Design a protein around this ligand. Structure first.
Ligand SMILES: [Zn+2]
Length: 100
């Protein structure tokens, strides 16, 4: 038996701005009532931000414009979409290497 294993590596891109404008056209907005992610167009993203507050019922849609409705995408999809680290959790893992 020629058992063989391996693993990946660590590499990514680097931005030059603060976390306040992800994606290209469409943007991501969180509800200030139920705390749910909502994808909106760049056309409304520059209009709903009049009070720094957004809600489901405030959404441009009709079937997905309400706190009673459901989410548009999964946390995993959103996390990978923006490239953030959703779900803090214990976060317990190896790190013997430490910073340095
Ligand atoms: Zn909501």
């Amino acid at each position: 038996g020629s058992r063989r294993a391996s693993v990946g590596s660590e590499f990514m891109v680097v931005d030059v701005t603060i976390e306040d404008s992800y994606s290209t056209e469409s943007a991501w907005v969180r509800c200030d009532d139920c705390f749910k992610w909502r994808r909106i167009p760049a056309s409304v993203v520059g209009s709903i931000d009049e009070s720094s507050r957004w809600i489901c019922m405030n959404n441009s849609d009709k079937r997905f414009a309400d706190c009673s409705k459901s989410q548009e995408m999964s946390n995993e999809e959103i996390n990978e979409e923006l490239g953030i680290g959703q779900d803090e959790a214990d976060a317990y893992d190896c790190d013997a290497a430490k910073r340095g």
